[PDB]
Amino acid sequence: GLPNNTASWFTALTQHGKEDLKFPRGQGVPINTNSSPDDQIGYYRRATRRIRGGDGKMKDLSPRWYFYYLGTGPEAGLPYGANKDGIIWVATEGALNTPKDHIGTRNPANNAAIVLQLPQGTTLPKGFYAEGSRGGS
């Protein structure tokens, strides 16, 4: 029912290889300081939009991998474990497998995305990077 104004609390990921992005159990989810450990769960979904180009004509921006808590975003209503092509299952140690509707997403007009930074020991997949951030370790 909500409007078409839902953004990812954190930055997105850009693909630069054949890999389709994949993380092991207990990894993948960025560090959230303004949130709980049981809420450190969700899934990644690719998004495609067209932004105004420099020459004036709108240009279709490349696809990016966005993350959002469970029960939120476009791919909302899918319980942990539910298979689905194009979607990745992420979860951190202690993260609870439940919908975080109470939290929801973060509107871009109201606020911006936070620099995505994985926890110590965790590393992004070969051929991928983080938007906004500078790197890792």
Swiss-Prot record:
PTM field: ADP-ribosylated. The ADP-ribosylation is retained in the virion during infection.
Domain CoV N NTD residue range list: 5-131
Positions where Phosphoserine occurs in the chain: S133
Consequence recorded when altering I51A: Partial loss of RNA-binding
Result of changing R25E: No effect on RNA-binding
Region RNA-binding, annotated ranges: 1-137
Result of changing Y66A: Significant decrease of RNA binding capacity
Taxonomic superkingdom: Viruses
Phenotype upon changing P108S: In strain: Omicron/BA.4
Subcellular location: Virion; Host cytoplasm; Secreted; Host extracellular space
Coiled coil: none
Residues reported to bind RNA: R49, R64, R106
Region Disordered: start-end pairs: 20-40
Outcome, altering Q120A: Partial loss of RNA-binding
Family designation: Belongs to the betacoronavirus nucleocapsid protein family.
Function, as annotated: Packages the positive strand viral genome RNA into a helical ribonucleocapsid (RNP) and plays a fundamental role during virion assembly through its interactions with the viral genome and membrane protein M. Plays an important role in enhancing the efficiency of subgenomic viral RNA transcription as well as viral replication. Attenuates the stress granules formation by reducing host G3BP1 access to host mRNAs under stress conditions.
Subunit structure, interactors included: Homodimer, homotetramer, homooligomer with RNA. Both monomeric and oligomeric forms interact with RNA. Interacts with protein M. Interacts with protein E. Interacts with NSP3; this interaction serves to tether the genome to the newly translated replicase-transcriptase complex at a very early stage of infection. Interacts with host NLRP3 and ABHD8; these interactions disrupt the association between NLRP3 and ABHD8, increasing NLRP3 stability, ultimately leading to increased inflammasome activation.
Protein name: Nucleoprotein
Lineage, opening ranks: Viruses, Riboviria, Orthornavirae, Pisuviricota, Pisoniviricetes
Residues of the full protein shown: 44 to 180 of 419
